[PDB]
Amino acid sequence: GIGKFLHSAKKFGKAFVGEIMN
Amino acid sequence: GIGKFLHSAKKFGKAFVGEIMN
Amino acid sequence: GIGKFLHSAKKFGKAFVGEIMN
Amino acid sequence: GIGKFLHSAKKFGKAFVGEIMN
Amino acid sequence: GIGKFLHSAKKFGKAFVGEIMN
Amino acid sequence: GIGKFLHSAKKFGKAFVGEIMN
């Protein structure tokens, strides 16, 4: 639900920024 | 790293599809 | 904040699915 | 269409960066 | 620019759906 | 597969940051 979406979004977003900078 | 990115992407993607259908 | 994020995510997600199918 | 996709993407992207930094 | 964004989005979106279903 | 996903993600992510800053 909303919790899983918000939590998963933040984790993914941080990992994605890391990939963009690699 | 790559593992965290791939894993987090799949979790987020599934949650996002769930949100779009809600 | 959280409201804008959730709302914008749903709008984007729906538009993105539309683009993928075009 | 393309307009909605581009507009919604920018709004979402800005909100997502905000969430990542929160 | 806009072309690269639109093109890259579609490619990514299709690949992402593929990952979600794997 | 995984290669296409990772490559397409990085390209999209960079283009998306560019759009957010435009």
Residue numbers in the entry:
A (entry chain A), B (entry chain A), C (entry chain A), D (entry chain A), E (entry chain A), F (entry chain A): 1 to 22
Per the authors:
Magainin-2 (Mag-2) is a well-studied AMP, originally isolated from frog skin, consisting of 23 residues and carrying a net positive charge of + 3 (sequence: GIGKFLHSAKKFGKAFVGEIMNS). It has been shown to effectively kill MDR strains of Escherichia coli, Klebsiella pneumoniae, Pseudomonas aeruginosa or Staphylococcus aureus. Like other AMPs, Mag-2 interacts with negatively charged components such as LPS, LTA, and bacterial cytoplasmic membranes, leading to membrane destabilization. In this paper, we focus on Mag-2 which had previously also been shown to exhibit discrete conductivity steps when embedded in planar lipid membranes.
While we failed to obtain crystals of Mag-2 in the presence of DDM, we successfully achieved crystallisation in the presence of a Mag-2:DPC ratio of 1:3.5 (4 mM Mag-2 and 0.5% DPC = (14 mM)). These crystals diffracted to atomic resolution, revealing a α-helical three-dimensional structure in which two antiparallel monomers associate to form a dimer via a prominent hydrophobic interface. One monomer was observed in the asymmetric unit. The structure of the monomer displayed a single α-helix comprising all residues (Gly1-Asn22) except Ser23, which was not ordered. Notably, the aromatic side chains formed a long-range connected network of five aromatic interactions arranged in a phenylalanine zipper (Phe5/Phe16’, Phe5/Phe12’, Phe12/Phe12’, Phe12/Phe5´, Phe16/Phe5’). The opposite side of the dimer was dominated by hydrophilic residues, including eight lysines (Lys4/Lys4’, Lys10/Lys10’, Lys11/Lys11’ and Lys14/Lys14’), two histidines (His7/His7’) and two glutamates (Glu19/Glu19’) at the C-terminal end of the peptide contributing to an overall charge of + 6. Upon further examination of the crystallographic environment of the dimer, we noticed that a hexameric channel-like structure based on three peptide dimers and threefold symmetry with reasonable peptide-peptide interfaces could be constructed (PISA´s resulting interface of 4596 Å2). The outer overall dimensions of this hexameric channel were 3.5 nm in height and 4.5 nm in width, and a very narrow central pore of approximately 0.35 nm. Within the pore, two layers of adjacent positive charges, mainly Lys10 and His7, were located, while residues 10–22 did not significantly contribute to the inner pore architecture. Specifically, we demonstrated the ability of the Mag-2 channel to allow the pass of chloride anions, being non-permeable to potassium cations.
